[PDB]
Structure formats: structure tokens, C-alpha cells
């Protein structure tokens, strides 16, 4: 029985205990290979975090490293650069920023959570459910808005004359000229993709042109219905909430379930080298690194706590289930869930902006 | 003012301005952080000029990370520190002496144009940068006139079994082949193409600097007659590279003497922000004959691009030059 170490960078000590138990139950599920848990919490600064990956995690020959967030949003980066130096797979558990889907920067990065951009998969499904064929896409001119725009337009062309796009620089408060162009384009369904601060600016200017009222349908994601954006959100808005996207224990026990399955698949192959033992004096990559990454991204785990676990070509999670929230009477109401491929109808009333009602029919 | 220079043992190098010279052949993430942090504490350094002797592209990834945490301008001069892949972080001051993928493809297309190599095939992996490489030369061929018949691009995966790479590689039916992949992947692709009789002199493999990399480490799996566009020009001496790097920093220091009235003091320590940095006055620097200006993405605007061929004596031969007047000068 040879030892295969798994790394982890988690939030608290209680979460590390859950990580060791997840690895412990993984060894119960079948024998010839024993998994060991190695973990630390986050460090004060990124330099010390990077040095902790070398001294505490890579020094123990970890085949993979799970990274979660510290208490109280680009903290996985030092883990990504240091372990990605040797092509060690880094599995993100909490971060949803779209910058981690660019393999030019984070080649060895995966995620049990989808990025904010993949919310366009649910937007595309509702355009088919209600037969919507003309929508207005308002995104911010940043790395997060570009990805939501590209993901949505890709789903439309793969059957851009079905959607118009309007962008704005983040931090702008004068969105008066922006929405005026949206109103002049025969706008009906508006899809917004911006941060919690930028969405609040769009909502305030929306009440200026009376685009909050009865002649519009607002389709958003998760950041646009959280915090100050929820306070100024127009009544009848429809946003998304990632199911289990914030647990950190569900994604620990699911990442371990996937890594354990991929480790056994790996050792069924010939010519396998051990991961590097520490950083100092080692400048060449892990020879099995790229292969093990390909084994991980090809892994299929349907029995996961957070649903079916599969990864796309960029390592982002697929088959993630969402909650379709509809703000009515200053309270978010779940009118249905995103099954993962379809939209399961919930017997609740959708209240469009203005006061009238419909449902997720057919 | 106070500048440090880190190099490797390659090219045989042994040693206002206050240069601090050192040489070590350890380029792992911990060694890179340790050297720069121990240089910052114990020597108020205002800029770093780095070079190594490896083909590890992730060294440039680490230097960019260190530059955004220490607020120290770092200049990739040679080796993996000069390999362009990831875009420079906007909050950093890390720049490299190298060219982008689009700048190399313009030279690669200029070679094929001057030799009437109109028919060519495209061979790429899923390695990052392949969709950028395909998209550039496709639009440049579709609308602008450098290629006439381009076979549909062939996608590969070196990590898969040889049988998978072999079945996909036989689909090539052109004399000129553009092969984009990592240097590690190129050793495997070209060693298998040789078994398929696709590395003979009746074929012309053109690869960017991601495949050639160091002009000093040549694997035996590279076939004789391999054409590449690289920027580790051995005539661009390592002694001259640090002179250009120092020139950029000293000019950026004197140009930062008046807009602000000071030079940013080095950070206290890496282990437990500035109102003005040398970020500006550094992306727009002319030194001696050529301008060493950079872009917001990190790479040079007018790089020392060069065309090289692999001699039958396992050596690279310089048979082209682009740096002059935005034109290709073949020999």
C-alpha cells in the first residue's frame, strides 16, 4: 500500500477536520492505495501563502491541492502559480471569478463551482422556455462582463442577431446615456451582468427612465441580487443563486470524491512518476502532471453531494444546479431551480416588474 | 538608483547606478521569492533585471507575482523569464524582452510569402495560446493575402497515447506545417512525425519561439531543418541585455525624478500601496538605437525577432532577421 498525499488550503481548522474525514471515508470506499490528508489554513500575505505551498504542501508530495477562501476574491492565485509551476492540479472550491478559466494564466486550475459567466447557460434556457428571441445584454467592461457576453453569444450562434450588447466602464455612476440607448432599441428583456456595486448604479438609473415599470423583464445573475444591489433591485426582477455554492464542506467532500476516483484511474496506467518533493532545487514540471490533469477533467462523478460533477475543457464545473429567484414584495422567492440541463417548474407565481403575474409554464 | 541583476551560468557571464550582481541556478518558486525578498530587505532595490538558463515558462509567472507583491520593477531578460504567455498583471511592473504570438506569426507568414509557400497545414495542441494562434493567421489569410490554401487545422493532445497522436498526425497533406505547442510537447510530436516520414527535407516545419525556446538546449528529437522564430538571439549578447534593462530603469528613474520628486523606497519586508511607482516612464523608453518600449500586456513592441534553422550538426543557424524597419531580411 503506497501513500498518495492530497493537499488542501482551507478557511478554518474545523474545515481541515472535515477534509481529513472526507479523505478518511475515501479510503473506506476501496485498498492497494491509501490516501493521506495534508492541509493548512490561509496565510496573512500572498508571499507567505506561496511559501507555505512549497514548504508545507509540495514538500509532502501532493498529487493535488484543494483551495478554499479565508474568512472575510482572488486569494487562490498564489496557490495557482506555485503549484501550477510544477503542473500540480489545483481545485478551487469557492472562487467564481472568470479569470481562472484562462489557461494562459491558470493552466492547472479546476473548479467544483462554475464561474459567474456560466450563468448564461440558464439565461439561454429561459430564452427557449418563453421563446424569447430578442434580448438586451448590459455587461460591465471588465474581465467578468466579457466572459458572460461571450458565453451567452456562443450558446445563441450554436443553433449574433438575437441580442444587442451595451457595455460600460466599472465604477461609473452616470448610466443615463447608456440606458437611453437601450430604451431606443425596442428593449423588452434586459440581461445585466455587473458587480454588486455596478448593478446598483444600473438599477438607480433604471428608475430614472421608468425602465423599472411594466414594460421590461429583468434577467440577472447572483451578484446583482446580493447586498446593496438587492435594496435597489426593481420589483419583479429574476436572478440566480448557485445551489451549495457557498458551503465549503459540500465542496470539500465532493472534491475529495473526484480526486480519489481520478487517482485510482491514474495508477491503472504505466510510467507514473511521483510529484515533486519540495520546491527548492526542482525546476522541471511533474512529468505525470499534465496527464493527471487530463484524467481529472475527464472524470465523471454523478453521485456528488452538489449533483453531477464533470469538468469542461477549462476545468470549470458543469452540471451545476441553480436557484431561479424572483424578487417580489422586497423578498426573493424561488420560482424554480435549474436542474442542470433543464428548468424544473416550481408551482409558484412569477411576478413580472409592474404587478402582473405568470409562471414557468410548459 | 539601486538595481539588482540575477543571471544564470549560461552564455559565460561573470562579474546613480548601484548594481548588485549575483548568480544562482535555482529557479523554483521558493528560490525566486527568497532571492528577491532577501534582496529587498538588506538592499533598498528599486528594480530587478532577471535571467535564467531554463525553459520553464512558469518563472515569468512567478516574477510577475513577485513584482505585484514587492512593488519592484522586474525585467525578464533571458530564459523562461522572457517567455511570453500570461498577460502582465496591471498592478505589477514586470516586463520581458520578447515578442507576442501575433508578432511571431507575422514573421512566420513573411517567410512563407517570400518562398511562395502558399499551401500549408495547421497543427496545434490544446495548449494555451492555440486559439490565439489559429485566429490570427486565419483572419490574416482569409482577408489579407499571405496564404492561399490552408488545410483545416489539426488539433492534437500530446498527453494522450501515441496511437491517438499518430492517427491525427497522418491527416497532414501539405509541405509546409505550422506547429504550435509547448517545447515539451514538440519533442513528442516531432519524434512521432519522424516515424511517419513527415520530418524529411520534403517538409518544412515552422514553429514559434514556444517550441524552440532556448537556443542553447536542443533536444535530439528535433529534426534537421527545423525553422523557428525566436528571440534568444545569441548575437544579442547577455552583456547587452542587462545594459538595455539597466537603461530602461535608470531612464525611468530620472523621468520619475520630476513628475514626482523622489524614487519609491523599497518595501520594508516581504514577511509581516505607493502613491507613485515607476510603472509609467518605463513603458516608453528609448535607449541607444532602438526603442525598448513595452505594451500594457507586458511584451515588447519592437522585439529582436530572428529566424533560425536547425543545422545537421545539431546547431541553430541564423538565416533571417526582422528587427529592421518591420521587414524580413533573409540571407
Amino acid at each position, epitope marked *: 500500500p503506497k501513500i498518495v498525499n492530497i493537499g488542501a488550503v482551507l478557511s478554518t*481548522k474545523k474545515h481541515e477536520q472535515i477534509f*481529513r474525514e472526507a479523505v*478518511n471515508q475515501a479510503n473506506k470506499r476501496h485498498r492497494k492505495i491509501q490516501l*493521506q*490528508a495534508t492541509s493548512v*489554513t490561509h496565510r*496573512p500575505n500572498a508571499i507567505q501563502m506561496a511559501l*507555505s505551498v512549497c514548504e508545507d504542501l509540495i514538500s509532502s508530495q501532493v498529487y493535488a491541492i484543494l483551495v478554499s477562501h479565508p474568512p472575510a476574491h482572488l486569494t487562490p492565485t498564489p496557490i495557482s502559480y506555485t503549484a501550477g509551476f510544477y503542473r500540480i492540479p489545483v481545485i478551487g472550491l469557492t472562487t467564481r471569478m472568470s479569470i481562472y478559466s484562462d489557461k494562459s494564466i491558470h493552466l492547472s486550475f479546476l473548479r467544483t463551482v462554475p464561474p459567474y459567466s456560466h450563468q448564461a447557460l440558464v439565461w439561454f434556457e429561459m430564452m427557449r422556455l418563453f421563446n424569447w428571441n430578442h434580448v438586451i445584454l448590459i455587461v460591465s467592461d471588465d474581465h467578468e462582463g466579457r466572459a458572460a457576453q461571450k458565453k451567452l453569444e456562443t450558446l445563441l450562434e450554436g443553433k449574433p442577431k438575437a441580442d444587442k450588447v451595451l457595455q460600460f466602464e466599472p465604477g461609473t455612476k452616470n448610466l443615463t446615456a447608456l440606458l437611453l440607448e437601450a430604451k431606443e432599441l425596442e428593449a423588452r428583456v434586459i440581461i445585466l451582468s455587473a458587480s454588486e456595486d455596478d448593478a446598483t448604479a444600473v438599477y438607480k438609473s433604471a428608475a430614472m427612465l421608468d425602465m423599472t415599470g411594466a414594460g421590461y423583464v429583468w434577467l440577472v445573475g447572483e451578484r446583482e441580487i446580493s447586498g446593496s444591489a438587492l435594496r435597489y433591485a426593481p420589483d419583479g426582477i429574476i436572478g440566480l443563486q448557485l445551489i451549495n455554492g457557498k458551503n465549503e464542506s459540500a465542496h470539500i467532500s465532493d472534491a475529495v470524491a473526484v480526486v480519489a476516483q481520478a487517482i485510482h484511474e491514474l495508477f491503472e496506467m504505466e510510467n507514473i512518476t511521483d510529484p515533486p518533493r519540495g520546491c527548492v532545487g526542482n525546476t522541471n514540471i511533474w512529468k505525470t502532471g499534465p496527464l493527471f490533469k487530463r484524467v481529472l477533467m475527464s472524470s465523471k462523478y454523478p453521485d456528488g453531494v452538489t449533483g453531477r460533477i464533470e469538468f469542461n475543457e477549462d476545468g470549470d464545473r458543469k452540471f451545476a444546479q441553480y436557484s431561479i429567484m424572483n424578487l417580489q414584495n422586497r423578498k426573493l422567492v424561488q420560482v424554480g431551480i435549474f436542474n442542470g440541463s433543464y428548468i424544473i417548474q416550481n408551482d409558484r407565481k412569477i411576478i413580472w416588474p409592474g404587478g402582473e403575474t405568470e409562471g414557468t409554464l410548459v | 538608483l539601486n538595481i539588482a541583476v540575477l543571471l544564470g551560468h549560461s552564455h559565460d557571464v561573470t562579474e546613480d547606478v548601484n548594481v548588485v550582481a549575483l548568480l544562482m541556478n535555482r529557479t523554483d518558486p521558493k528560490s525566486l521569492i527568497t532571492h528577491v525578498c532577501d534582496l529587498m530587505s538588506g538592499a533598498r532595490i528599486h528594480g530587478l533585471v532577471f535571467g535564467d538558463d531554463t525553459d520553464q515558462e512558469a518563472v515569468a509567472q512567478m516574477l510577475d507575482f513577485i513584482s505585484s507583491q514587492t512593488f519592484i520593477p522586474i525585467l525578464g531578460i533571458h530564459g523562461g523569464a522572457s517567455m511570453i504567455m500570461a498577460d502582465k498583471d496591471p498592478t505589477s511592473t514586470f516586463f520581458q524582452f520578447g515578442a507576442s504570438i501575433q508578432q511571431q506569426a507575422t514573421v512566420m507568414l513573411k517567410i512563407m510569402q517570400d518562398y511562395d509557400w502558399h499551401v500549408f497545414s495547421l497543427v496545434t495542441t490544446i495548449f494555451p495560446g492555440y486559439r490565439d494562434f489559429i485566429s490570427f493567421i486565419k483572419t490574416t489569410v482569409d482577408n489579407s493575402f499571405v496564404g492561399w490554401d490552408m488545410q483545416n487545422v489539426i488539433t492534437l493532445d500530446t498527453s494522450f497515447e501515441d496511437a491517438k497522436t499518430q492517427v491525427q498526425l497522418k491527416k497532414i497533406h501539405s509541405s509546409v506545417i505550422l506547429l504550435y505547442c509547448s517545447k515539451d510537447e514538440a519533442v513528442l510530436i516531432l519524434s512521432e512525425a519522424r516515424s511517419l516520414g513527415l520530418t524529411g527535407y520534403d517538409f518544412f516545419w515552422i514553429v514559434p519561439s514556444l517550441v524552440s525556446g532556448n537556443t542553447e538546449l536542443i533536444p535530439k528529437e528535433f529534426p534537421s531543418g527545423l525553422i523557428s522564430v525566436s528571440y534568444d538571439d545569441w548575437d544579442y549578447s547577455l552583456e547587452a541585455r542587462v545594459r538595455d534593462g539597466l537603461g530602461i530603469l535608470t531612464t525611468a528613474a530620472s523621468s520619475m525624478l520630476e513628475k514626482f520628486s523622489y524614487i519609491p523606497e523599497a518595501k520594508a519586508s516581504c*514577511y509581516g500601496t505607493p502613491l507613485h511607482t515607476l510603472h509609467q516612464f518605463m513603458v516608453n523608453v528609448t535607449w541607444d538605437g532602438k526603442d525598448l518600449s513595452f505594451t500594457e500586456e507586458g511584451y515588447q513592441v519592437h522585439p529582436r525577432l530572428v529566424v533560425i534553422v536547425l543545422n545537421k550538426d545539431r546547431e541553430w543557424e541564423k538565416v533571417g532577421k526582422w528587427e529592421n524597419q518591420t521587414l524580413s531580411l533573409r540571407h
Partner: antibody
Amino acid sequence: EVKLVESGPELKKPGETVKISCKASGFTFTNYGMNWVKQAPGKGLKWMGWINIYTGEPTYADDFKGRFAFSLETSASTAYLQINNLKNEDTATYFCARGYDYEGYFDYWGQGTTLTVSS
Amino acid sequence: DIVMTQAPATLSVTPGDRVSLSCRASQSIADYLYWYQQKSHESPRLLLKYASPSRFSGSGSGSDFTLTINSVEPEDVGMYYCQNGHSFPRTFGGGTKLEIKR
């Protein structure tokens, strides 16, 4: 290449003050905690306390609450142990062990500092 | 305060046998139960991490733990302490001296 080298043995009369050093090497000093363990000649291990290294926050035990003090010098990567008003029961060997992840297991120990307290 | 009690405090094994040293706790300490080996004239050395060389293995999990040596070597002679790392103040066990047959 991780090492913890302590100062040499000491001899002190009852009622004096000792200062024991413990210099580290091979790892980032501010990423771990520094524990202190006392061991009497025939007896076994007794935990005295622990001091966080990133934040100089000591945590003494109930028995060792009063006279023992944990000092720190991050510039030289060294932790100290100062004992005031020595009794006859302070004659023991004092180890410094690295706390993994600040409050985890003791993964690297020093060679030990033998302290003799008699007249 | 948690009291760690490991019994027996003395064992005599044969070169190649399987030794199992138990460690009991008054309260439940989850898996925060470390192990240390103090030889003749050295400082103690950390053996296992969180109740888990390739011959030392750890099992047990709340109040009852165990340290197993699947093949004892002549270099295994020494003391073995189990440390509570779950609640302050940190406490150690009484120790168990491991003598070997010959």
C-alpha cells in the same frame, strides 16, 4: 534543512533569571508557531505554552502562567524563553518545538536546553 | 484539563512482530491526537499527524487511539508519547517504553 538550535546549558542560583534562545532555519519563520516543552530528568513531557510568530501573541499555561515569558525576534528568526525567580523545581530540559500551522502538531524540535537551578 | 493515559507503559516485542500502543483520553478530542518518539539521548520526533516511516500507522478517533508498528526494528527502542492537540492546555500521555527481545 529545517533546524532548531537552542542555546547551551545554564547554571543559576535560586531566584535568578535565565533566557534561553532558539534560532530557526530552513523555513519561513512567520508561518508557524513556537511551542515550549519542559521535561524533568526522570519525568516526562509537560507543555509550558505557545507563542504565535506572525503576531507576537503568547499563550501561557495555568501552571506556567506567572514567571515565564515568551519573547520573539523575527529579524533574527529566534524565539526566547525567560524565567524569573527560579525555584528548585525548575531544574529540567526545555525544548522548543515548531507548531505546525501555528496550533498544530510539533513537527520539529530543538536539541534541548538543560537548566540546573541549585546553590 | 484533559488527562492522557496510555497503557501499558512497558512492552517487549520480537524483531518482526506487530506492536500496538494504545492511548486513552478522558474527553473526546476528535482526531487531534499526535504521536512522538523520544529515543535514548535525543529530543522527541513527530511520528504521526492527526491519528494517521512506512511501518508506523495510526487508527482510532475520539477517545481511544492506537499506534501500530507492523514490523518492529531494533531502532524502535525508546519512549512513545501521545499528545492532545484539541484543547488548551496541551497535555501529553504518560509514555510507554518500548523494549525489544533479543
